[PDB]
Amino acid sequence: QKLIANQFNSAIGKIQDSLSSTPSALGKLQDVVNHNAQALNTLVKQLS
Amino acid sequence: NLVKNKCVNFNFNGLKGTGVLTESNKKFLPFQQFGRDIADTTDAVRDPQ
Numbered sequence: 001q002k003l004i005a006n007q008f009n010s011a012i013g014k015i016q017d018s019l020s021s022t023p024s025a026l027g028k029l030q031d032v033v034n035h036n037a038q039a040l041n042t043l044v045k046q047l048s
Numbered sequence: 049n050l051v052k053n054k055c056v057n058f059n060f061n062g063l064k065g066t067g068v069l070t071e072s073n074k075k076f077l078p079f080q081q082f083g084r085d086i087a088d089t090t091d092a093v094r095d096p097q
């Protein structure tokens with residue numbers, strides 16, 4: 001149990017470091033936001 | 049010419065428009081007159097007087 005708890009704690013801390021690191025993996029969430037923003041920009045620019 | 053805090057039909061330089069005129073801090077160049085934004089629409093104007 002002690003070893004498993006230590007491993008779990010280390011794994012969680014590494015998860016924190018992985019997310020806190022620069023190579024953001026949230027591209028799935030960013031693609032939707034980018035698509036909606038760019039679609040709106042094209043639509044608003046289409047008036048010209 | 050003059051109008052403050054009122055949704056009005058402005059016809060500066062013969063260009064039609066309707067909106068509220070307020071003070072701005074857009075540091076125009078000595079020759080610059082108009083103003084625009086990312087939305088390719090007018091955003092500022094210089095007092096003819």
